Coordinates of C-alpha atoms and ligand atoms in Angstrom, one line a residue:
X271 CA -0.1 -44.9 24.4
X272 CA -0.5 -46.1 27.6
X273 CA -3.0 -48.3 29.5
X274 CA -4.8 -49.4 32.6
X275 CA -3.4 -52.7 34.1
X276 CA -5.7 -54.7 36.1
X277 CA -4.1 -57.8 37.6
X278 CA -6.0 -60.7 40.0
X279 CA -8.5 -59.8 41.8
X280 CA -11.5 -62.1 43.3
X281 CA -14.8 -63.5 42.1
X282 CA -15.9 -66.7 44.0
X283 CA -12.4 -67.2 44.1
X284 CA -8.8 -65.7 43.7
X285 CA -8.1 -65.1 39.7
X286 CA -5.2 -64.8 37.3
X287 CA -6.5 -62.6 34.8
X288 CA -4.2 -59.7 33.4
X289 CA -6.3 -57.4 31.3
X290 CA -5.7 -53.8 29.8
X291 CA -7.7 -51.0 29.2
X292 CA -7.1 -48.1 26.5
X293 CA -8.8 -45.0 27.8
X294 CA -7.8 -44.0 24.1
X295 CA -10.3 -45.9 22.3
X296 CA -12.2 -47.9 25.2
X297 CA -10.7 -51.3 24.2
X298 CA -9.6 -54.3 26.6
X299 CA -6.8 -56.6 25.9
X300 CA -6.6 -60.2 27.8
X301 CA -2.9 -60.4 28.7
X302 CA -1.0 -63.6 29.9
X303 CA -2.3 -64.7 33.3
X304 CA -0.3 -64.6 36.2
X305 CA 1.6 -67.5 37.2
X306 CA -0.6 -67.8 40.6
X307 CA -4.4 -66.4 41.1
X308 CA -4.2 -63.8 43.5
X309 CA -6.7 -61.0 45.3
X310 CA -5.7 -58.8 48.0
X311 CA -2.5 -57.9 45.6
X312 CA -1.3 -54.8 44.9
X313 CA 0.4 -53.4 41.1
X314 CA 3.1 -50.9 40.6
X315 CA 5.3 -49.8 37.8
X316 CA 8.6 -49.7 37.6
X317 CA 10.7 -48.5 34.4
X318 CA 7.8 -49.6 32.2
X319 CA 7.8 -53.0 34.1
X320 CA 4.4 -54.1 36.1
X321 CA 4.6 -55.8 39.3
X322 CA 2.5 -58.0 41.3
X323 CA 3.3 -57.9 45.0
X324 CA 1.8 -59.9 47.6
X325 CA -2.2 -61.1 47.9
X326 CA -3.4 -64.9 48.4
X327 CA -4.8 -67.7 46.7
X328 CA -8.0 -68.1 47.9
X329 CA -9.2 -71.6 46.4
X330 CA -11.2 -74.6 46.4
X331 CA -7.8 -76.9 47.2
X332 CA -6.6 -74.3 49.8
X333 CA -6.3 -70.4 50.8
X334 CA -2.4 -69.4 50.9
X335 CA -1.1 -65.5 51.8
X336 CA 1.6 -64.6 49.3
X337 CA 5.0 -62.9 49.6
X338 CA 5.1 -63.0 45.7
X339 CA 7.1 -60.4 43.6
X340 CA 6.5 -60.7 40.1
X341 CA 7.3 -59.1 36.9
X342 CA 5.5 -58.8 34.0
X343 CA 7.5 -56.9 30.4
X344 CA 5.1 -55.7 28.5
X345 CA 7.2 -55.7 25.4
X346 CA 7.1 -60.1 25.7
X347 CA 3.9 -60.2 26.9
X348 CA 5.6 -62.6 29.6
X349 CA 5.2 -63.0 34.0
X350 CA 9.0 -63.6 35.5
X351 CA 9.0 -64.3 39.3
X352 CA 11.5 -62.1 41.2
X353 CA 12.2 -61.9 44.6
X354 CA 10.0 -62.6 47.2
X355 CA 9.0 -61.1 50.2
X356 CA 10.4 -61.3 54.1
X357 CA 6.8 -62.4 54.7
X358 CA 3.3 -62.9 53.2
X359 CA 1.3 -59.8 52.6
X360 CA -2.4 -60.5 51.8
X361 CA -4.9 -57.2 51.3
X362 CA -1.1 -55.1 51.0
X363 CA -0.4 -51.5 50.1
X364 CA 2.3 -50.4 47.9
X365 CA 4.3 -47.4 46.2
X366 CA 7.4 -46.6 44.4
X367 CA 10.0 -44.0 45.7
X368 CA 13.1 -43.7 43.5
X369 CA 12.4 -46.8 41.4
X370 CA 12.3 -49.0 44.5
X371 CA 8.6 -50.7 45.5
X372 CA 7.7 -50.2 49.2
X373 CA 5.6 -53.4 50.7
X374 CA 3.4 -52.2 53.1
X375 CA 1.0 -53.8 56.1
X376 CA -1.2 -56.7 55.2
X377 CA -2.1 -59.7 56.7
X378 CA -0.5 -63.4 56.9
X379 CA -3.2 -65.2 58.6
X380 CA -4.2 -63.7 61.7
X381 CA -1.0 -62.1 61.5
X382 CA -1.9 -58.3 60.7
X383 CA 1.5 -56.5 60.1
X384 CA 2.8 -53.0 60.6
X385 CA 6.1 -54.2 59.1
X386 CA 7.2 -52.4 56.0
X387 CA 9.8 -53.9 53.2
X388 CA 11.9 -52.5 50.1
X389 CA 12.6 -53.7 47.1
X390 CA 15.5 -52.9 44.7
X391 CA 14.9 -54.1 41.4
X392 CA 18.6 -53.6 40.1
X393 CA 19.5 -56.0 42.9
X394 CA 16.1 -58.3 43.5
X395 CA 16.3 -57.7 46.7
X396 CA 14.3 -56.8 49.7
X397 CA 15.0 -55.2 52.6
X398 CA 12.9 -54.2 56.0
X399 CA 12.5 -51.0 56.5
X400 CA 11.2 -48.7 60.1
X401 CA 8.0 -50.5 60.7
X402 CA 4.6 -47.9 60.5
X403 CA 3.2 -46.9 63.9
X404 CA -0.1 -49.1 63.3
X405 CA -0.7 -52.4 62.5
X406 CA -2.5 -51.5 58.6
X407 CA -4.1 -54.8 56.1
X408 CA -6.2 -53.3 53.3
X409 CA -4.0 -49.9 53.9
X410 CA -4.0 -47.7 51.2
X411 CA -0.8 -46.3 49.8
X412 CA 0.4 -43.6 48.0
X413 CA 3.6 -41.3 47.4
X414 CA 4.1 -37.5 46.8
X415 CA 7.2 -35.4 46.8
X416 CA 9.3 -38.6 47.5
X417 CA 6.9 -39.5 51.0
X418 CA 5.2 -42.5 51.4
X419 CA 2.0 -42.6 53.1
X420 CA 0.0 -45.1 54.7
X421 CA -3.7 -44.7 54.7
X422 CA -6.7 -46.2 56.9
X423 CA -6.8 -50.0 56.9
X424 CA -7.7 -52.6 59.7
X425 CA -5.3 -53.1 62.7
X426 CA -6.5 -56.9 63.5
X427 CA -9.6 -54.9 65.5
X428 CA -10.7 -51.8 64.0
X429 CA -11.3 -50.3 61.0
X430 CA -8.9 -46.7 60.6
X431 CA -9.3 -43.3 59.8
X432 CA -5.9 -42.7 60.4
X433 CA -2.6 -42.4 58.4
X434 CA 0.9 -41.8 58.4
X435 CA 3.6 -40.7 56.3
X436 CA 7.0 -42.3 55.9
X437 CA 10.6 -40.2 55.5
X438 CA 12.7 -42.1 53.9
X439 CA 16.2 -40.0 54.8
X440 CA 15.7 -40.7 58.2
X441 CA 13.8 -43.8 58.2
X442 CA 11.0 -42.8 60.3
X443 CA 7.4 -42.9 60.5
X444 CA 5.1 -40.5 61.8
X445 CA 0.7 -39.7 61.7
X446 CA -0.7 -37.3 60.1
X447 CA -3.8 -36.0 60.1
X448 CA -6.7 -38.9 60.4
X449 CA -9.2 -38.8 57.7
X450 CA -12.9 -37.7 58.3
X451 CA -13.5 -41.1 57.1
X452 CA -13.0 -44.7 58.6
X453 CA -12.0 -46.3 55.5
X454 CA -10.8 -50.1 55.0
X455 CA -9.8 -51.3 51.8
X456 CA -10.3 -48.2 49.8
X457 CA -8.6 -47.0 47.0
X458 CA -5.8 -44.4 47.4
X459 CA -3.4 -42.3 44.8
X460 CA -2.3 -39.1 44.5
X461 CA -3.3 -36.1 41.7
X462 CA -1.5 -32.9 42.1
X463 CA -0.8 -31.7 45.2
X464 CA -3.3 -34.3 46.9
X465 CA -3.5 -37.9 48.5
X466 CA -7.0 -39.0 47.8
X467 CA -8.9 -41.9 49.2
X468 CA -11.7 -43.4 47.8
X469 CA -14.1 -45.7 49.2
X470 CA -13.2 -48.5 51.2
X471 CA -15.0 -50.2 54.6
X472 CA -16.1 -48.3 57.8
X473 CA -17.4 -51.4 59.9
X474 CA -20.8 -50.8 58.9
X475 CA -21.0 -50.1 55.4
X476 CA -19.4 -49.7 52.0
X477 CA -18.7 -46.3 51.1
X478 CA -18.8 -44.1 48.1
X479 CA -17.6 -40.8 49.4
X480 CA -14.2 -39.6 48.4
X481 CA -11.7 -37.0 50.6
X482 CA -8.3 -35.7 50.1
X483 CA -5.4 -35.1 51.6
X484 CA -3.5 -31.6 50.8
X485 CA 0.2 -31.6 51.9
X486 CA 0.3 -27.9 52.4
X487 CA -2.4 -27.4 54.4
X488 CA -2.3 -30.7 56.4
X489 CA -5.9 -31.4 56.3
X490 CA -8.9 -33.7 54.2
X491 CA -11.9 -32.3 52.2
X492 CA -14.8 -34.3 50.5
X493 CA -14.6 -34.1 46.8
X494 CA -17.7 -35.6 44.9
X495 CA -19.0 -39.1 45.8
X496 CA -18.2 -41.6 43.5
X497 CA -21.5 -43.2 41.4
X498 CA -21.0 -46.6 43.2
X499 CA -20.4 -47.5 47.2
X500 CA -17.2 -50.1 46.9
X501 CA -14.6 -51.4 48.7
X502 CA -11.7 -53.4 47.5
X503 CA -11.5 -51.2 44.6
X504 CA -8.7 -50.6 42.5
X505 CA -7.7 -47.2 41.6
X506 CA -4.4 -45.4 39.6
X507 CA -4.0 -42.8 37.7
X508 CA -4.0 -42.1 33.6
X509 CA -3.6 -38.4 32.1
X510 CA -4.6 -36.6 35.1
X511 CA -7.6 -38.4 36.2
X512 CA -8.3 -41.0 38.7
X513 CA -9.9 -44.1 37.5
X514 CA -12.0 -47.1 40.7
X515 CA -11.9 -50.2 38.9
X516 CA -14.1 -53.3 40.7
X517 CA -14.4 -53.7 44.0
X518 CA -17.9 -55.0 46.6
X519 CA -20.6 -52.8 47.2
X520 CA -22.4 -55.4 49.7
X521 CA -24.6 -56.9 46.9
X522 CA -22.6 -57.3 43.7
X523 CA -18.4 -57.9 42.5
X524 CA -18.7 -54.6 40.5
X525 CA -17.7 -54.4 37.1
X526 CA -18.5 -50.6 37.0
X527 CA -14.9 -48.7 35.9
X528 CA -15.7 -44.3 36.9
X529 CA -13.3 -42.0 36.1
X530 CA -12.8 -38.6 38.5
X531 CA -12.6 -35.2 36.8
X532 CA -11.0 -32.9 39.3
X533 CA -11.6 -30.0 37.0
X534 CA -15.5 -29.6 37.2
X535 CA -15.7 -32.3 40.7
X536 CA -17.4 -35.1 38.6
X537 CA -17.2 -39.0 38.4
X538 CA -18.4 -40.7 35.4
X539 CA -18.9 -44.1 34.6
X540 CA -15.8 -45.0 31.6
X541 CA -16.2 -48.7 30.9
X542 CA -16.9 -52.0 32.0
X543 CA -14.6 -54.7 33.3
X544 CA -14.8 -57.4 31.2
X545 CA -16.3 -59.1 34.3
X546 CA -17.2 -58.0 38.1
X547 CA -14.4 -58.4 40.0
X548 CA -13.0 -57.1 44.1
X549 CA -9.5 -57.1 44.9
X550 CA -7.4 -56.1 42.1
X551 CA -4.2 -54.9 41.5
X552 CA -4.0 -51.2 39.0
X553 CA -1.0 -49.6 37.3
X554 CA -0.3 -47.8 34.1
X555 CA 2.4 -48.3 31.5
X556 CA 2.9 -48.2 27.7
X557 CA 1.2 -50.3 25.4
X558 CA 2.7 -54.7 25.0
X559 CA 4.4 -53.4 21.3
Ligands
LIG1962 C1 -16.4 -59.7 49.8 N1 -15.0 -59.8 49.8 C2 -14.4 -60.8 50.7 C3 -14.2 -59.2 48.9 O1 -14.7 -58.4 48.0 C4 -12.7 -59.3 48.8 C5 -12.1 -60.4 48.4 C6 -10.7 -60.5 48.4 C7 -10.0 -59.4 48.9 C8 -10.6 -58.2 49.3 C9 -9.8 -57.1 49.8 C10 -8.9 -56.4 49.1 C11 -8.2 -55.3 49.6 C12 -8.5 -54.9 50.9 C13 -9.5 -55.6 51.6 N2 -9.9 -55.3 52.9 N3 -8.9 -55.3 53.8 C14 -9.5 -55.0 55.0 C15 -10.9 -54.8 54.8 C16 -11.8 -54.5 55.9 O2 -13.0 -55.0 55.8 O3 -11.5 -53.8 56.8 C17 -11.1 -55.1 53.4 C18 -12.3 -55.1 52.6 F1 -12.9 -56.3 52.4 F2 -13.3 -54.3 53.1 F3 -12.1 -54.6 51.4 N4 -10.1 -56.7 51.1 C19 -12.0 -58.2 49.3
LIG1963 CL1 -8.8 -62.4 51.5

């Protein structure tokens, strides 16, 4: 069995929670907290490990960006710090090619980076990579067929409905095709053959409508909006369907968890968040024993 991971996130302020959600049987379990509250962070997987890269501690005594890689096993229930980070990343994007974690974009202060970093887990180390062609914090990420793309964001001025994709073998960057979308701080993954995006920030308002990205053909459709407007959502994937977890709609921190059914083009309400919530990091692995 395998669950939903949601780690941080933000309500009034930067939080430690690790909970996990059993799309099995609809059950949350309150996992050890992380060794430093955190929004603005992003989770990945890595050989069954979760990570927690980047975010800050927004808090009463202080607001600090974080270059922060840590590990959590969920076989000890237990947080180890590894390696951190050339620089902070705060509102980051990430994604694994090969069982290395790519860092992506982010902010450190007014710093808004386009800078890009890799991370080898049989090593702890990280290593900068080509930089993207755009400044990106709240950048979505996602890989498919070994690429990385970078999608949307804020470049320190505007919001973006642009993106780019990332080849490793020859260490280059390039754009694709811009989304029909400004989108800040959505929520991106992949199903199938697709990089979707949900979500996110336009400048003006919160957004609920959903588009993806088809490799083959090089351009973005609409799918079905989701139920709630959000941004700072967290998204993965579980069985084949995309879950949004959290996020702002411009009134409420949402607890509202939807699940996408590519199949019949539906989103449906799964669950609740044990409380609302913006900010998160999401992955999937097994179940702690
Ligand atoms: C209302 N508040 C501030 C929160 O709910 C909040 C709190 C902490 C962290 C984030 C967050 C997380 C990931 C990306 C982003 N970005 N990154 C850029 C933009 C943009 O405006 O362009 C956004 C946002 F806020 F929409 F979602 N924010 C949002
Ligand atoms: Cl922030």
């Amino acid at each position: 069995g395998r669950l939903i991971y949601t780690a941080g996130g933000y309500f009034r302020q930067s939080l430690s929670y690790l909970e996990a959600y059993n799309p099995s049987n609809g059950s949350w379990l309150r996992l050890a907290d992380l060794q430093v509250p955190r929004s603005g962070l992003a989770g990945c997987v890595v050989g069954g490990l979760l990570y927690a890269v980047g975010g800050r501690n927004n808090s009463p005594d202080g607001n600090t960006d974080s270059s922060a890689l840590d590990c959590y096993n969920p076989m000890t229930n237990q947080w180890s710090p590894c390696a951190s980070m050339s620089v902070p990343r705060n509102r980051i994007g990430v994604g694994v090619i090969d069982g290395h974690i790519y860092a992506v974009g982010g902010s450190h202060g007014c710093i808004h980076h386009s800078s890009v970093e890799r991370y080898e887990p049989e090593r702890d180390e990280w290593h900068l990579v080509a930089p993207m062609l755009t400044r990106r914090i709240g950048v979505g990420v996602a890989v498919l067929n070994r690429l990385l793309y970078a999608v949307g964001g804020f470049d320190g001025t505007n919001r973006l409905n642009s993106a780019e994709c990332y080849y490793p073998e020859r260490n280059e960057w390039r754009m694709i095709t811009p989304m029909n979308t400004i989108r800040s701080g959505a929520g991106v993954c992949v199903l199938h053959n697709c990089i979707y995006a949900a979500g996110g920030y336009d400048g003006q308002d919160q957004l609920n409508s959903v588009e993806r990205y088809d490799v083959e053909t090089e351009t973005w459709t609409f799918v079905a909006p989701m139920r709630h407007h959000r941004s700072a959502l967290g998204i993965t994937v579980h069985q084949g369907k995309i879950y949004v977890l959290g996020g702002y709609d411009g009134h409420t921190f949402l607890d509202s968890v939807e699940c996408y059914d590519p199949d019949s083009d539906t989103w449906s309400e799964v669950t609740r968040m044990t409380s609302g919530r913006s900010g998160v990091g999401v992955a999937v692995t097994m179940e702690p024993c």
